[PDB]
From a paper:
Because the S. mansoni genome does not codify an adenosine phosphorylase, one alternative to fulfilling this activity is 5´-deoxy-5´-methylthioadenosine phosphorylase (E.C. 2.4.2.28) (MTAP). This enzyme catalyzes the reversible phosphorolysis of 5´-deoxy-5´-methylthioadenosine (MTA) to free adenine and 5´-deoxy-5´-methythioribose-1-phosphate (MTR1P). The observed overall fold of SmMTAP is similar to that of members from NP-1 family of low-molecular weight purine nucleoside phosphorylases (PNP), which consist of a central β-sheet distorted barrel surrounded by α-helices, as observed in other MTAPs from human and bacteria. Furthermore, a comparison of the KM levels reveals that S. mansoni MTAP can use adenosine with the same efficiency as MTA, which is one fundamental difference between S. mansoni and its host and reveals a potential target for schistosomiasis drug development.
We also could obtain the structure of the double mutant S12T/N87T in the Apo form and in complex with adenine. However, it is intriguing that subunit E of the double-mutant (S12T/N87T) and subunits B and C of the S12T mutant were found in the open conformation, even when they were bound to adenine. In some structures, adenine does not bind in all subunits; the only WT structure whose BBS are all occupied is the orthorhombic SmMTAP adenine complex. Interestingly, in the S12T adenine complex, the presence of adenine does not cause the gate loop to close (subunits B and C); this is also observed in the S12T/N87T double mutant subunit E (the modes of adenine binding in these structures are shown in Fig 6B and 6C). No significant differences were observed between double and single mutants. Even in the double mutant structures, the position of sulphate/phosphate was conserved. In the double mutant, the KM is increased approximately 12.3X, kcat is reduced 2-fold and kcat/KM is 25.7-fold lower than in the presence of phosphate.
Author numbering:
A (entry chain B): 3 to 235, 239 to 291
B (entry chain C): 3 to 236, 242 to 293
C (entry chain A): 3 to 14, 20 to 290
The structure:
Amino acid sequence: KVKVGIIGGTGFDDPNLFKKVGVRQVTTPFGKPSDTLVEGFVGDVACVVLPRHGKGHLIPPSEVNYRANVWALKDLGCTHILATTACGSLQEDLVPGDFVVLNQFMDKTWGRENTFYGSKPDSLKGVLHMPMAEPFCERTRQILIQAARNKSINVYDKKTMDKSACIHPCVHAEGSAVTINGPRFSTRCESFIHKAMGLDIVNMTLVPEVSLAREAGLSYASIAIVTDFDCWKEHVCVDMVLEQFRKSVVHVREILLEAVALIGAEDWTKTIEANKALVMSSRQDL
Amino acid sequence: KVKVGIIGGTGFDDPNLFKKVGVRQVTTPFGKPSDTLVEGFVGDVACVVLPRHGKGHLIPPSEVNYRANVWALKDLGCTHILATTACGSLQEDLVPGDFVVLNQFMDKTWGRENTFYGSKPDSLKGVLHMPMAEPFCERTRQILIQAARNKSINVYDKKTMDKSACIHPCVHAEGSAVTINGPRFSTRCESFIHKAMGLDIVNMTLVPEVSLAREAGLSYASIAIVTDFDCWKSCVDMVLEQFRKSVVHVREILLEAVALIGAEDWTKTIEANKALVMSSRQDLLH
Amino acid sequence: KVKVGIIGGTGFFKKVGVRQVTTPFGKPSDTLVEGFVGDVACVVLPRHGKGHLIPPSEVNYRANVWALKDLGCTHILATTACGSLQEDLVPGDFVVLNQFMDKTWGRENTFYGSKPDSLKGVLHMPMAEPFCERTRQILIQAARNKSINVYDKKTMDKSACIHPCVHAEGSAVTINGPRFSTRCESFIHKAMGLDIVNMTLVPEVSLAREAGLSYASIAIVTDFDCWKSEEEHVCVDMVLEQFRKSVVHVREILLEAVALIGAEDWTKTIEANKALVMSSRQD
Ligand SMILES: Nc1ncnc2[nH]cnc12
Ligand SMILES: Nc1ncnc2[nH]cnc12
């Protein structure tokens, strides 16, 4: 029934979340995934892990085969996808070492395959217009947040708490990402424009991954690791992965493993059926 | 002599604006148009209709061959293009069931062929930089608005009328569209950003259609149908019936607009359309 | 030593010869003119080719930058025509840019990736201040040396703005083209606080940094885009008429800037340019 896929970003190229049971070199109608998929169990919950950028981190954000990654996880029976992403902060209260359970995004990517459906031969037949107002699976979002609570990691909810309750390092219970195409980081001019728009963090990999997960009928939630402030305060590759970030990986692993258990502890029949019905009801050719 | 092409969007996949005299199954130097073009008359005015998404609505917005559609209409001697588009509202006074005769846009599309000219072997030779300050044919916009008046539909001009003149359903006498690439709808984050920029509606099909019409020397005007509020604002059977009624009204507007176009001389406007292309050829002026 | 490449846009020394080169990323826009400014080697490359037949979205920026790198250039000075989005930047002015916002798409914007037509690797370049500051200041000093007014918004104000002037800083929005902006887009860009709009700065500036080169751009204001009156709305004739009046000033600045670069030592700067590339490899 429930099976949890995990897409590991920067810092999660060889996650070792569970003892490896099987290794799947698979293909999809949309090509090869970033790497082999590793299947196993967390407790009694089947789980599948794949590194977004492949082994050795050779695939840049704009060239990841998001379609193949999501479709391959779905083909293996995944009902959920938990994903990590390293990001820069655009706001004073989002400090390096914090995490963010995202609930919103603004898309500035281009040139990436962002839908399974279309009119050309390398796509599924149909025109699919998915609602994306709240683009994540809210139930799965709350499980990431509860998992943090269960692992004694501070949770800061701006809606029900004051700024004095923002004790770092903390998990931010909501937040918006602007997803840029990369590979370059933002200019200071771009960073201030994103901040003035009210965006919380900037990354390169959330879109179209989040969109395709919903197209596939899967429940998707992302946990973003704040690795540095973006250049409005500067961001470098070495800074995006440092001693704080090495500590961040430890706690993100604990959140992910606890989130998988928490997913497995609940019935998802109605949510899964709703995910599938949202796809069929978004077809405008039918 | 004038000849009006009509590109029908959602709700116009198979319109019967007139008894079809002939059909033209053609291709263009830029590929196949979305469907067979249907030829006929409104009164004594020659007319040509093609559905933007093809019959059966199998072609999504980013895959529509805008170049082929415009070129095919130009090849048949069209002097004008009237186009429809179903859109979401970004503003409180643009209510489902209203219409907008667009006069402005912000472009957020990518990955679409948006010009007939370039340095590639299959493009027309030359560098064409068209002015787009006011990107529609203003004379044809005013015909659409007058057609609405002639068909007893309210017209609301916010530049001269108090918001107490905004009586629904109404044709908004001006408005701006943000054209997103699709196929997904916007997030709430994106919707509120577009709203804060002052954009009136969101759609997926205006650009590059409007640009290519001007490149082709054709007078282009768009009438948008507001089908719903975009997701900045938090049953379906009522919305569907409302859209059906909107299609009936837009069909009335198109039929009257064709007659009004035929009732005037367009020699000078057509010549100015063609001169604007020649004066935008940077390679010739250099 | 130093060697300065010049990438000249719309309508834009002792000439020794013309050279055709190939690159791993294709052919440059045109042949390159090799020569000297005093004792400094200099190479001139027309961005849009002879006859201006290549539109901004189709310029092979990777080839142009790599061609100059392969010839041993340490610096690239670039020009571009642009539209002003702000009252105090008027046609005939110049802007030594220091910032940009990118609205381009569909252009090859990096030398590195996982496809066979790119260099193997994942390169995430910092771009907070995307130009070479030393080279920007040389463009400004060159204008001073040629008796062209310099206007600095951080220390002067509109009352002290003498045209035609070189604006000592400024941000560009780079749009993909080939069409000019709508009024709606122009006002949105202006409300974001951008100074000018153009079509060719990106990915040229990004690829220069990827190649370890010092890059600075001087933009020529040819028009007010289309946020003003209808008689002031941009079109090709308007851009070309003003560009022809401003070329000789751009010439004087660029040629003076080449001499000023050659008068200084760039050893540590060049080292830092190269080291920045190496430290940005994530693979
Ligand atoms: N500042 C930043 N911008 C974009 N992606 C990032 N990933 C980590 N830090 C980032
Ligand atoms: N207004 C403008 N927009 C874009 N590119 C330009 N080049 C010159 N003027 C321009």
